[PDB]
Amino acid sequence: MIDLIVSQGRVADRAAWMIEGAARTARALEERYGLKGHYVGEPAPHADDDWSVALPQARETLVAVREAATESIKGDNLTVLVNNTCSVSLATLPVVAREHPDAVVLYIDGHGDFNTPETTDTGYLGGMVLSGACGLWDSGHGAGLRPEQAVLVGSRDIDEGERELIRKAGVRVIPPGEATAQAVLDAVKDAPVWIHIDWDVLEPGSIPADYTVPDGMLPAQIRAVFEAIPAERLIGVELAELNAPADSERAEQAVAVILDMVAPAFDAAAA
Ligand SMILES: [Mg+2]
Ligand SMILES: [Mn+2]
Ligand SMILES: [Mn+2]
């Protein structure tokens, strides 16, 4: 079955509606699969604070997400986190790597999220998530994820400094035009799999752009990844960074696309 965990506490959010987007996504999953989410954390307004300020502010939410994710990973169900920001994964990825040292993390994101305190241009915690989990810097919530076990999927237009940190650490990158289901399966080999998704990986707007080559990943490419990962091997899935206001038509349309992408994996786990 499925364990649904929903972050609703601020974790460095610089966007206005990602807590609301997480809630609406969770609601759609509850209605479709007959689930009741475990909601963690208290909302707070977005702000452009430095990671050194935002990170301590988020400690209570991160600790609570860590303990909820730990219980789920140790059990028998599919762990599904609907997270406001990628930074929630500073708490979950060290758990994944500890409980499943052989897991491959598919970090599906238009960005690398591999900055350190020394290299970040913007101070944003969300751009430091994968490097933190891999121990390039100390988030205060552990590390232990081998960069050799992390695969960035859909990332593009990466700052050349950050791209060299990624390369030196051994993180593989599969850009959108290479990110077929088979390309992703070849990267995973026989490993159990954790999927982390930042929706900015998706090609914006124009749903049937039939005569142009997309720069981002298409919804069909994400679905093909969820179709291809065997249910027995899937440890869990994180859905992050839907920026859409509560009760907006936009949020209703967005979660319908999300449910279509994740259905192969979630339908199988619910059986
Ligand atoms: Mg499980
Ligand atoms: Mn991200
Ligand atoms: Mn991103």
Swiss-Prot record:
Mn(2+) 1 binds at residues 109, 113, 198. Its cofactor is Mn(2+). It is an enzyme of class 3 (hydrolase). GO terms for cellular component: cytosol. It catalyses: N(omega)-hydroxy-L-arginine + H2O = hydroxyurea + L-ornithine. GO terms for biological process: antibiotic biosynthetic process; arginine catabolic process to ornithine. Its EC number is 3.5.3.25. Keywords: Antibiotic biosynthesis, Hydrolase, Manganese, Metal-binding. The keyword Iron does not apply. GO terms for molecular function: arginase activity; hydrolase activity, acting on carbon-nitrogen (but not peptide) bonds, in linear amidines; manganese ion binding. The keyword Flavoprotein does not apply. It comes from the Bacteria. Disruption phenotype: Cells lacking this gene do not produce cycloserine (DCS). Mn(2+) 2 binds at residues 109, 111, 198, 200. InterPro entries: Ureohydrolase (IPR006035), Ureohydrolase_dom_sf (IPR023696). Involved in the biosynthesis of the antibiotic D-cycloserine (DCS), a cyclic structural analog of D-alanine, used as an antitubercular agent. Catalyzes the hydrolysis of N(omega)-hydroxy-L-arginine (NHA) to yield hydroxyurea (HU) and L-ornithine. Belongs to the arginase family. This is N(omega)-hydroxy-L-arginine amidinohydrolase. It comes from Streptomyces lavendulae.
